[PDB]
């Protein structure tokens, strides 16, 4: 039995006393509130909040039976007897405590509304709506998973509801979530220890909800543009010669390549026994500085793997112990335990000593030429209960280990190279880890169609809760004895339309596309080149993700927020604003039914126009593509393919506009900067191109403009080819800034025409110079 | 009747007095002699000699009836009565005067040996052996020529004999050559005026003959590497917008492009009336500095056309007259005459005033950003007899006008940009013009199969007499009403294997490959890319041409100097040392008979091995290639394709070696420098890679090395893939500098293998790092 006794309102937090203790409420924004139970006691700090100490001014009002603590849009309604808090946006109930907080173990119980659908929990393969499921909150490997998992590498103690709120359990400890499984109408959060707090974030739409969520948990800094390029990876290159041979293979096979990734053989010849060496195995990598410099000359970055563990057999054991860098046992000695790789300890990233020691090693390797970092096994993969960290035992801090590891490395990289954007790829984190630039991948997926078929669900679940660059080991990682060629092709095709292009797998079967047969390469080469040609599209989506948290992959349900049934879809998704992608995830599929939203759509590959009032579209499949539809009104921007983003230029732009009278107004943008300055957005050192189309019965008008302060090397004038798909055959003239130009009606492909209409393709091509001043192009019948 | 009277031997020239006057003999080298009749009188200087005043020490010996003036290898035997000079190499008679020199008009008569075959005269379409022909020495347009011409743009007063000598008529005047036509056994040279001299050069082989010839007439300076890239050209881009649209089309169609060429519309909107303006038509080219700068940003050079003529209607007429820059009439007034383009005069490049005036204009335009120069109509196309130049009348200097024009422009460009290599493309020159960097093309060829079929004969005739970069308007230039697609494709395929890749034609039919249909582009795109991938092969041949005069295209007859019948062949030729090319020059050809020299040959496209003891090889044709055979023992070097040579890198090399036991020793080289320094060779600022193969019964050994001082940006270590074609399946191991490496026998395409044998292709691939130290690779059975 819990009831209200008293409250204090200073400041600007609400402190409530019940018969059971203190509760602190603080608005972290107009749309987000942090609720801390046991506010009286000492406990772990928030990990989820980007600014834990902030508290914006709210209004408090009191009545006989209730308190009301209200921010801009979000209101907390506090019922005095029995004590229960409920949350409202406008006058709409979002979420209500049932029993709410209960003590010893930590326990939060909320009511769920009938029909309420619940996404969340991070990586699970359970269905998009996780209501009716119970699962642990304990980051844990799931080697070789395929089509089901209740527990994987990167769980999140957070949910997103069809009521358009996000609830975060701001707790790092071994726990569990019960989403109306045990009791149909109860959401239960549990933890063995740790912080007893939750955060509720509201929004008026899913995009606004995600914007509000990332406002308080952190926005991802724009990654280096090279993160969007082609990665060479396997587990693992065995030598410098093999690594050099692989870079060379990309050159001789004419596949783009930005980055090569070195797995654990860079520090030892065996899988076991060397982890912790954190230094080059000179028997097999004899000249690593020259190797990295030679790669940089070819525009290729080098990324190295690192892990939390230092083995007793490794060259750094004695030094780590001496430095007090490792987690301890209750006795105060370094804790050693049996990992797959051997007996070893874990670097205590929560301590000053561990952080300084580990950071110094990253600094040294980075000075040698390492461009980015891969942090594997950060669950931590093995984490005995009696392990003691500076701020708590293993079970208490477990789900924040990887998160703090990312923070440490992010801070380190920014201190060493304040003019570069850190690249940090990790397997396990916490709510908010995106603010440290964490780029997660979905772990050791099996080489099965089931493994591929689960990737959209996983990506969308992580994308919705803050992680825009979630991606998979393309082609599959685990086991297998011979390449499943059709599966591999489908996986690398899908790869083009998801955040990071990194084929990776155990090296008994090649993961890199350059080591495939002629048919496979003939299919994938123009697709990897397409990835590069589409960099302006992808990099602009990245820009929007940094600005607003908008994920690069968006679920189908964004298309109609009043149709909750769409939430179940995990087979079609949006890549940026304009492309509806439906990966092929079974062998031999001859056609697909695409649940395209009501409107006009074009076949990305064939230009075919489809119109639908709601009924799904049936498209035939082929081996060389996967089904992709373009939304009418889309501006799709391209640059010429380059081999590496170091050579990226937009002196030449080609933009495809998908015209249809059903879209009388359309807008596009292209974000351009130097691809590397971490401060480009803050300082406005960018070139933001905007395009607006106005489509009426007798005219199609485009207004082009540029804003921003520009940047070093920005082209003053871009040669631009605008291709208008589904263009009327009735346009008689073009005005460019008032100057009339005839539209040629033949030989469009065979003359340097400035305006020409191709009657067979229904395409109207305009070629012009896009300089710094506004440009108006008007087509008139 | 002529007879010897007296001689003086100082110094070191021989001066002979006959009853008719003085004759001066001077060795210009051990292998070349200049013979000047009327040595007593004042006459035009030599144009053919690079060092006219030189005279090396020779030996003179006298007998009752003869004088002997002897250099290293060449000896002049002077018969006293009747007077006649004959020339010997060793004790072999090369050439004997008949009546020799006869006066008023200039006339030289020599005996021809029975069976002696005679190439020469420069551009004619008459058959490789011109014996039995008579033709004028008067540079003259032959618009729309096809399969026959006795008189074209670029005649040369020179012949090459199967006796392995070259005879030059060192005379610039309107004349004629009668090669045993009128009198079966007489070679007659005639001129209306000008210098009465000839030069005889001997050699012990055709390569040595050409080396000796270019030693005394001039060696071509290495062109900028960009000269070997893709040119966009037509007659003509009508505006800046059209020019920008064409550069953009190369970008959007993914064809390489180094240079765009602007025809006469850059200075006026009409073909007639504007010539002489030598300045931008701002109505149609409003921002030419920005245009050229924008192209440079994309790695694209701009070349402008210029002509010798200044029209009275042009903006520069009054100024040219004021400056005394134009040729005059006998009265002393500027000479004006009716050209196709209108009434106008000719710039007197032979005068100080004309040279200074014209040079100042090139300087100004070059400062604005023009990268190279196209000089059209230098015959001069129209040249009235009464026209007076500073050094003689039109008929006297005619065939040296273009030559002096090139010298003027070359000197100008070197003075303005001493750190760049001039690019000078012209239609008409003289013996020796190559020393001013002249790059000639074969004029206004018709768009017919006949026009294409004549190009090998023309190229070989010019190549043998000093002009390595002779080439054609690819696809054809003149007339036509609709594209002959098959002809166009064949012409641009041949284009890949001849010196300069410049499609060009009258613009009612597109000349650029980017304006062609999908099938045409699908065929040509990978071929234009091949051109770029083969830059190390082509640029190395260019290097050899600068060193020794060795032409890039070599005739079949080089393959067997004891088989004079080969001289007639004008259908197959060598592109560099290793490729035997047979262009397809008729429609619908289904197969070809290739007269491959005795030995082992491989199909360049299919890898098929052929062996022949002399009988021709029959190969089937296809539309996507033309027949090319690779000589056994060839090292064919490639780099990855780039869009422009400004991006050229050899960090990655791929080298194909064509192994056969019939070739126990083979050598290759790759010349690398910065692609732009005119002094790179002289100063040894280059990286010369050498490869040697030793092929025995049980071993194949490669020795790799580098010499030269290197250059700025040179890669220290190149990733190298060596592909050995027709490799034995019996090699069991590889030693690289003594370190043994196993040869994998499977999965060569699908692993980062360092050594692997592909049993299905009979190819053995080695991948390694080629650094600055010598490298030995040994394969052993
Ligand atoms: C962690 O472990 C590895 F298997 C070996 O380092 C990686 O290759 C794998 O991608 C990652 O999950
Ligand atoms: C000279 O005249 C032109 F026809 C016009 O300038 C050129 O296009 C042609 O290539 C050249 O022979
Ligand atoms: N994280 C997981 N859900 N792991 C499931 C592992 C199941 C497997 N049979 C094992 O015990 O090893
Ligand atoms: N240089 C030449 N061979 N020209 C031949 C031109 C022939 C042509 N019938 C004419 O008189 O115009």
- CATH code, B603: 2.60.40.1180
Protein residue with least CA distance to atom 3, ligand 4: B151
Min distance B427 CA to chain A CA atoms (Å) = 27
CB atoms near residue A614 (< 10 Å)? 10
Half-sphere exposure of A190 (CA within 13 A, CB side): 15
- Residues B233 and B293 reside in one and the same domain: yes
Q: How far apart are CA B282 and CA B269, in angstroms?
A: 10
- Residues B386 and B505 reside in one and the same domain: yes
Q: Give Cα B648 to chain centroid, integer Å.
A: 23
The answer to whether B248 contacts A719, with C-beta atoms less than 8 Å apart, is yes
3-state SS, B445-481, equals: CECCHHHHHCHHHHHHHHHHCCCCCCECCECCCECCC
A519 and chain B in contact, CB less than 8 A = no
Residues from chain B that touch A754, judged by Cβ atoms under 8 A, are 241-242, 245
Contacts of B456 (CB under 8 A, 6+ apart): B553, B570, B571, B573, B583
- Residues B130 and B216 reside in one and the same domain: no
- Residues A371 and A471 reside in one and the same domain: yes
- Which residues form the pocket of ligand 2, taking CB atoms under 6 Å from any ligand atom? B 235, 263-264, 305, 376-377, 427, 443-444, 504
- List, as ranges, residues 667-686 from A with C-beta within 8 Å of B: none
Q: B568 φ, ψ to 5°?
A: -70, -20
The answer to whether A721 contacts B252, with C-beta atoms less than 8 Å apart, is yes
- Residues A222 and A89 reside in one and the same domain: no
Selection from B126, B108, B107, B105 nearest residue B117 by Cα: B126
CB atoms near residue A583 (< 10 Å)? 22
Residues from chain A that touch B243, judged by Cβ atoms under 8 A, are 752
Binding residues of A: 263, 381, 427, 444, 504
Selection from B576, B502, B508 nearest residue B539 by Cα: B576
B761 and chain A in contact, CB less than 8 A = no
| B69, two tokens | 């003036």
Q: How far apart are CA B541 and CA B554, in angstroms?
A: 11
| A88, two tokens | 């409202």
Rounding to the nearest 10 degrees, give the CA dihedral for residues B488, B489, B490, B493.
Answer: 120
Q: Give Cα B27 to chain centroid, integer Å.
A: 26
Binding residues of A for acarbose: 263, 381, 427, 444, 504
- Residues B589 and B677 reside in one and the same domain: no
Q: Is residue A584 a contact partner of residue A455, using CB atoms and an 8 Å limit?
A: no
Residues from chain A that touch B249, judged by Cβ atoms under 8 A, are 752
How is residue A698 annotated by DSSP?
S
What are the contacts of A282-287 at 24+ separation with CB within 8 A? A284/A238, A284/A239, A284/A240, A285/A239, A285/A240, A285/A243, A286/A240, A287/A240
CATH number of B21's domain: 2.60.40.1760
What are the residue numbers of the active site of A?
A: 376, 379, 444
Query: What residues form DSSP beta bridges with A155?
Result: A122
Question: How is B568-602 classified by DSSP, letter by letter?
Answer: G--S-EEETTTEEE----STT--EEEE---SEEEE
Protein residue with least CA distance to atom 11, ligand 1: A376
| B354, two tokens | 């004309």
Q: How far apart are CA A260 and CA A266, in angstroms?
A: 12
Q: Is residue A69 a contact partner of residue A14, using CB atoms and an 8 Å limit?
A: yes
Of the residues B240, B517, B749, B752, the best mutation for testing chain A's interface (the one with the most A CB atoms within 10 Å of its CB) is: B752
Q: How far does residue A235's CA lie from ligand 1's centre (Å)?
A: 7
Q: Is residue A676 a contact partner of residue A225, using CB atoms and an 8 Å limit?
A: yes
PDB experimental method: X-ray
- Tokens 């070093």 -> residue: A712
Q: How far apart are CA B467 and CA B438, in angstroms?
A: 8
Q: How far apart are CA B582 and CA B551, in angstroms?
A: 17
The answer to whether B640 contacts A251, with C-beta atoms less than 8 Å apart, is yes
CATH number of B428's domain: 3.20.20.80
Q: Is residue B658 a contact partner of residue B621, using CB atoms and an 8 Å limit?
A: no
Edge-to-edge order in the sheet of strand B718-725:
B635-638, B652-658, B718-725, B763-770, B755-758
Q: Across the A/B interface, how many CB contacts are shorter than 8 Å? A: 111
Q: How far apart are CA B192 and CA B138, in angstroms?
A: 11
Distances from the Cα of A69 to the Cαs of A34, A59, A209, A429, in angstroms?
12, 6, 20, 32
Min distance B749 CA to chain A CA atoms (Å) = 6
- Residues A1 and A108 reside in one and the same domain: yes
Q: How far apart are CA B77 and CA B60, in angstroms?
A: 10
A749 and chain B in contact, CB less than 8 A = yes
Q: How far apart are CA A650 and CA A675, in angstroms?
A: 12
**Atom number of ligand 1 nearest to Cα A377:** 1
Q: How far apart are CA B746 and CA B729, in angstroms?
A: 12
B750 and chain A in contact, CB less than 8 A = yes
Domain boundary among B545, B562, B581: B581
| A622, two tokens | 């082929």
Q: Is A181 exposed, middle or buried (0-12, 13-18, 19+ CB in 10 A)?
A: middle
- Residues B147 and B267 reside in one and the same domain: no
- Residues A369 and A388 reside in one and the same domain: yes
The answer to whether B245 contacts A652, with C-beta atoms less than 8 Å apart, is no
Residues from chain A that touch B749, judged by Cβ atoms under 8 A, are 515-518
- Residues B761 and B620 reside in one and the same domain: no
| B416, two tokens | 């303005």
Q: Is residue B59 a contact partner of residue B242, using CB atoms and an 8 Å limit?
A: no
A510 and chain B in contact, CB less than 8 A = yes
- Residues B735 and B758 reside in one and the same domain: yes
Distances from the Cα of A252 to the Cαs of A97, A107, A225, B763, in angstroms?
62, 59, 24, 16
Selection from A431, A520, A385 nearest residue A198 by Cα: A431
Selection from B364, B361, B363 nearest residue B347 by Cα: B361
Nearest to A248 among B517, B518, B767 (CB): B767
Question: How is A560-617 classified by DSSP, letter by letter?
Answer: -TT-GGGGG--S-EEETTTEEE----STT--EEEE---SEEEEETTT--EEEESSSPE
Contacts of B709 (CB under 8 A, 6+ apart): B683, B684, B685, B686
Total domains in the fold of chain B: 4
A41 and chain B in contact, CB less than 8 A = no
Half-sphere exposure of B143 (CA within 13 A, CB side): 6
Q: In terms of residue numbers, what domain contains A156? A: 1-199
Q: Is residue A368 a contact partner of residue A288, using CB atoms and an 8 Å limit?
A: yes
| B325, two tokens | 């820059």
Q: Which of A139, A140, A377, A381 to mutate to test the pocket of ligand 3 (most atoms within 8 A of CB)?
A: A140
Nearest-5° angle of CA A487, CA A490, CA A491? 85
Min distance B767 CA to chain A CA atoms (Å) = 6
- Residues B499 and B601 reside in one and the same domain: no
Edge-to-edge order in the sheet of strand B14-18:
B4-8, B14-18, B21-29, B32-37, B197-202, B165-169, B155-161, B118-122
Number of helices followed by number of strands (H, E) in chain B = 12, 47
Residues from chain B that touch A290, judged by Cβ atoms under 8 A, are 716-717
The answer to whether B752 contacts A515, with C-beta atoms less than 8 Å apart, is yes
């Amino acid at each position: 039995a819990v009831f209200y006794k008293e409250h204090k309102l200073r400041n600007d937090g609400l402190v409530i006393t019940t018969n059971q203790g203190n509760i602190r409420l603080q608005f972290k924004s107009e749309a987000a509130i942090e609720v801390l139970y046991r506010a009286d006691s000492k406990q772990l700090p928030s990990f989820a909040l980007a600014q834990p100490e902030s508290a914006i001014k709210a209004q408090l009002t009191e009545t006989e039976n209730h308190l009301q603590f209200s921010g801009g849009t979000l209101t907390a309604r506090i019922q005095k007897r029995p004590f229960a808090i409920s949350y409202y946006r406008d006058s709409e109930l979002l979420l209500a405590e049932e029993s709410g907080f209960q003590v010893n173990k930590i326990n939060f119980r909320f009511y769920l509304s009938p029909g309420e659908k619940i996404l969340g929990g991070g990586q699970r393969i359970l269905g998009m709506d996780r209501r009716g499921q119970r699962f642990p909150l304990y980051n844990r490997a799931h080697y070789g998973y395929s089509d089901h998992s209740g527990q994987m590498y990167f769980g999140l103690p957070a949910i997103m509801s069809s009521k358009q709120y996000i609830l975060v359990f701001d707790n790092s400890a071994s726990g569990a979530m019960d989403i109306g499984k045990t009791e149909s109408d109860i959401l239960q959060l549990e933890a063995k220890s740790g912080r007893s707090a939750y955060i509720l974030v509201a929004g008026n739409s899913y995009p606004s909800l995600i914007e509000n969520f990332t406002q308080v948990t952190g926005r991802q800094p724009l990654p280096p543009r090279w993160a969007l390029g082609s990665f060479a990876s396997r587990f693992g290159y065995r030598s410098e010669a093999e690594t050099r041979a692989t870079v060379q293979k990309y050159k001789t096979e004419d596949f783009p390549l930005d980055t090569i990734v070195l797995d654990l053989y860079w520090f030892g010849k065996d899988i076991k026994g060397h982890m912790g060496n954190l230094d080059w195995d000179k028997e097999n990598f004899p000249t690593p500085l020259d190797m990295m410099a030679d790669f940089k000359q070819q525009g290729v970055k080098t990324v190295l793997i690192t892990e939390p563990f230092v083995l007793t057999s490794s060259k750094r054991w004695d030094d780590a112990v001496k430095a007090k860098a490792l987690a301890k046992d209750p006795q105060g000695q370094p804790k050693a335990f049996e990992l797959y790789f051997g007996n070893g300890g874990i670097i205590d990233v929560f301590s000053k000593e561990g952080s300084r020691w580990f950071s110094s090693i990253y600094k040294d390797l980075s000075k040698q030429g390492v461009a980015g970092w891969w942090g594997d096994l950060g669950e931590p993969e093995m984490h005995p209960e009696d392990t003691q960290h500076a701020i708590g035992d293993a079970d208490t801090v477990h789900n924040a280990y990887g998160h703090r590891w990312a923070e440490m490395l992010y801070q380190q990289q920014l201190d060493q190279f304040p003019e570069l954007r850190p690249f940090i790829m990790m397997r396990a984190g916490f709510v908010g880890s995106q603010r440290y630039g964490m780029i997660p991948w979905t772990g050791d997926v099996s080489r099965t169609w089931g493994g591929l078929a689960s990737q959209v669900e996983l990506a969308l679940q992580m994308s919705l809760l803050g992680f825009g660059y979630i991606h998979s080991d393309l082609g599959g990682f685990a086991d297998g004895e011979t390449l499943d060629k059709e599966m591999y092709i489908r996986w690398l095709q899908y790869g083009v339309f998801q955040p990071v292009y990194r084929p990776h797998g155990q090296d008994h079967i090649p993961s890199e596309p350059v080591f495939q047969d002629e048919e496979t390469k003939a299919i994938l080469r123009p697709l990897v080149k397409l990835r590069y040609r589409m960099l302006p599209y992808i990099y602009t989506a990245a820009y929007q993700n940094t600005l607003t948290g908008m994920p690069l992959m968006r679920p189908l349900f964004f298309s109609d927020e009043k149709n909750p049934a769409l939430i179940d879809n995990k087979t079609s998704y949006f890549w940026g604003d304009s492309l509806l992608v439906t990966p092929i995830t079974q062998a031999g599929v001859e056609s697909v039914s695409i649940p395209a939203p009501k409107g006009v759509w074009f076949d990305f590959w064939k230009d075919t126009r489809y119109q639908t009032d709601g009924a799904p579209l049936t498209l035939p499949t082929d081996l060389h593509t996967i089904p992709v539809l373009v939304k009418a009104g889309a501006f799709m921007p391209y640059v010429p393919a380059v081999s590496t983003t170091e050579d990226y230029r937009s002196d030449s732009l080609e933009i495809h506009y998908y015209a249809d009278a059903s879209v009388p107004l359309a807008q596009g943008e292209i974000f351009e900067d130097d691809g590397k300055d971490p401060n480009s957005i803050k300082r406005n050192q960018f070139d933001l191109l905007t395009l607006q189309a106005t489509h009426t019965d007798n005219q199609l008008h485009f207004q082009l403009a540029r804003t921003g302060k520009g940047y070093r090397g920005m082209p003053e004038r871009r040669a631009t080819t605008l291709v208008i798909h589904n263009a009327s055959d009735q346009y008689q003239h073009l005005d460019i800034n008032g100057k009339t130009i005839a539209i040629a009606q033949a030989d469009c492909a065979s003359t340097p025409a400035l305006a020409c209409y191709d009657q067979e393709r229904r395409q109207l091509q305009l070629v012009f110079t896009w300089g710094r001043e506004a440009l108006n192009l008007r087509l008139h019948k």
